[PDB]
């Protein structure tokens, strides 16, 4: 029953909503539990970091197309290029993505650089102390300052390419021959008429011959 000028109401309170009301009165309490779990996890993994290396990835829509972010795992082709055994990779903390594939060559190049400088920064204790092997650490460059986050030490350096640059005058290029607004209009109309134009051309050639 409207009485004055108001906005037409629509409040979806017509079922028995009172039977399903969730209140978050334990927001601080949960936080404490999560922190206790992290410390326990950190103590179990004594000298290793907590997280696992992720690759660099570009967002998948036309919007958000500009930014980059972390992925889920490295593709099988990326691992082979860096020279890493397929099965040893998960053990030493590098992840693996069963179902991603590389179409271009910049993401491929970016990720192999990531692996290469990681392997240079990786220590590797032997499986038994009394018998070291050839691929282990020689026990003398084995004491150094370590990291544990591996998200801050290996996060995206810059998601968005630098906003602006500077160039000397008389080096600025020239636009498209006729304008840059006529270029868009022409490129649009061409795709609108692709079907009709090709059909008309084809009929004339066959009919004449």
């Amino acid at each position: 029953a409207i009485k004055h000028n108001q906005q037409i109401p629509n409040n979806h309170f017509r079922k028995h909503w009172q039977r399903r009301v969730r209140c978050h009165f334990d927001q601080p309490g949960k936080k404490v539990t999560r922190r206790l779990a992290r410390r326990a996890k950190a103590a179990a993994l004594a000298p290793r970091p907590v997280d696992k290396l992720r690759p660099i990835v570009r967002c998948p829509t036309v919007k958000y197309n500009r930014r980059t972010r972390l992925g889920r795992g490295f593709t099988l082709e990326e691992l082979k290029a860096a020279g890493i055994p397929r099965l040893l990779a998960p053990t030493i903390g590098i992840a693996v993505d069963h179902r991603r594939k590389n179409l271009s060559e910049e993401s491929l190049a970016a990720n192999v650089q990531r692996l290469k400088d990681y392997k240079a920064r990786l220590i590797l204790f032997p499986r038994k102390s009394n018998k070291p092997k050839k691929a282990d650490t020689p026990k003398d460059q084995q004491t150094a300052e370590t990291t544990t986050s591996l998200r801050t030490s290996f996060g995206v350096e810059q998601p968005l390419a630098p906003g602006f640059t500077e160039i000397s005058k008389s080096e600025i290029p020239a636009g498209i021959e006729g304008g840059a607004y006529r270029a868009l209009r022409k490129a649009r109309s061409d795709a609108r008429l692709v079907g009709v134009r090709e059909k008309r051309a084809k009929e004339k050639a066959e009919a004449e011959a």
Binding site: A1, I2, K3, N5, I8, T61, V62, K63, Y64, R66, L160, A161, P162, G163, F164, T165, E166, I167, S168, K169, I172, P173, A174, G175, I176, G179, A180, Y181, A183, L184
Partner: protein, 148 residues
Amino acid sequence: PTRFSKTRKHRGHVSAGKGRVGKHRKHPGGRGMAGGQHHHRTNLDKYHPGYFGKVGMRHFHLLRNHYWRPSINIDKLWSLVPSDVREQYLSGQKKDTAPVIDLLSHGYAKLLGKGRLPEIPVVVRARYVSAEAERKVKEAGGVVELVA
């Protein structure tokens, strides 16, 4: 705070300010938007003209990402370069360099043109551009490219 509210000033007066003849019953008139076309038509026609009826075509499974292209005028274009570098250009001490502004990074897609512009050559990199915007940025001494 309930200690100062008009219900505390009604104590002692029978009917609590709701009237003796019309007694504030439960739901006289119907619940919600009932009677829109029958007894509430006067309200729905003095206000909200356009409530009833159908218009336009429908569109199955709309994805809002296909239609993302925020705009920016041409008089706010100079506000995209930091303040210290900006004052050096407008004051006139460089004379030999031109800034290359990239709208896409700062979160814009189309460069409309509404205001004026100072006579300093720039270089704009946009996805879309308007006819009036192109003319003004060109007569200042610069050019606009298409980047996709």
